From Swiss-Prot, chains A, B:
Its EC number is 3.5.1.88. InterPro entries: Peptide_deformylase, Peptide_deformylase_sf. It catalyses: N-terminal N-formyl-L-methionyl-[peptide] + H2O = N-terminal L-methionyl-[peptide] + formate. Homodimer. The keyword Ubl conjugation does not apply. The gene is def. Binds 1 Fe(2+) ion. This is Peptide deformylase. Its cofactor is Fe(2+).
Length: 171, 171
């Protein structure tokens, strides 16, 4: 079931999210959240979504879109559950992108993030991962983890002159 | 008659505005602009408005609101036509304010501008002024001149964490 997606300005979006325990991810409540989160993301036509966006301060993130309307060019992103992620840049190289955020409706801003990263995380079944990610997903993952730390993409804007409303940016 | 108010993202809003000549302000076209600008500002329930906002790169600004709904607290601002303004801070002191902009719909951001300034300008009849301004008007005037230089308030944001959507900020 779709849940409300908090908008920038709501203090929750700037608070820190706490890690999920290995027990908790078994709870019937956790499973309902992952369900609602996905349900919420697909409905919003999103690429990713962090728990804080729907009001929960837990280190939980879901991704996956394929043929996403909001971001035409972008390659598919398989559905995965990302828990307690910890990221580290592996390069200073960046691939600028006009990011958008479901908590920042109708806008887009240019952001340069490292295009190669190391991500450590645990999935819905408690499986541990530590892989180096690159490309579009590296951007999505970084964007999603920021949420777990109360950071939004507008905080990483490269130039406020490269920021605005969608319909307008698209000219 | 109300004219379209360009939204952030439209390149016009980042271009430089040129000064108005003493002849031009006599033209029947200039007079129509001041009329439309006022008509546009009152309809938008604005406090000020610069020509570039409606698509004209001329150093033209109009102010005046009285009992403005969008900004409750604010004191009245008498209607005046500000042409070719040139501002200079007279203090380092600031009076933070949650500014908004008709070219940046539905949002508000915290901005700290000097609360005392020197403004030199010419009115619709060609009268020259050079007065020191303070208080709310100092903020409005500074905000409006930035427009004439392609600057929006989001460029002067104090903290991206102190920025967001109205309905949300108002909690
Ligand atoms: Zn987001
Ligand atoms: Zn403005």
């Amino acid at each position: 079931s779709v849940r409300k997606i908090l908008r920038m300005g709501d203090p929750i979006l700037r608070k820190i999210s706490e890690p999920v325990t290995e027990d908790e991810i078994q709870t019937k409540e956790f499973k309902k959240l992952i369900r609602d989160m996905f349900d919420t993301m697909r409905h919003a036509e999103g690429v990713g979504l962090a728990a804080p966006q729907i009001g929960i301060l837990k280190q939980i993130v879901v991704v996956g879109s394929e043929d996403n309307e909001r971001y035409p060019g972008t390659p598919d992103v398989p559905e995965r559950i990302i828990l307690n992620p910890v990221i580290t840049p592996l390069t200073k190289d960046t691939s600028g992108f006009w990011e958008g955020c479901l908590s920042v409706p109708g806008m887009r801003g240019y952001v340069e993030r490292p295009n190669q990263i190391r991500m450590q995380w645990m999935d819905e079944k408690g499986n541990q991962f530590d892989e180096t990610i690159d490309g579009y997903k590296a951007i999505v993952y970084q964007h999603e983890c920021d949420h777990l730390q109360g950071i939004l993409y507008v905080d990483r804007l490269k130039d406020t002159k490269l920021f605005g409303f969608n319909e307008t940016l698209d000219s």
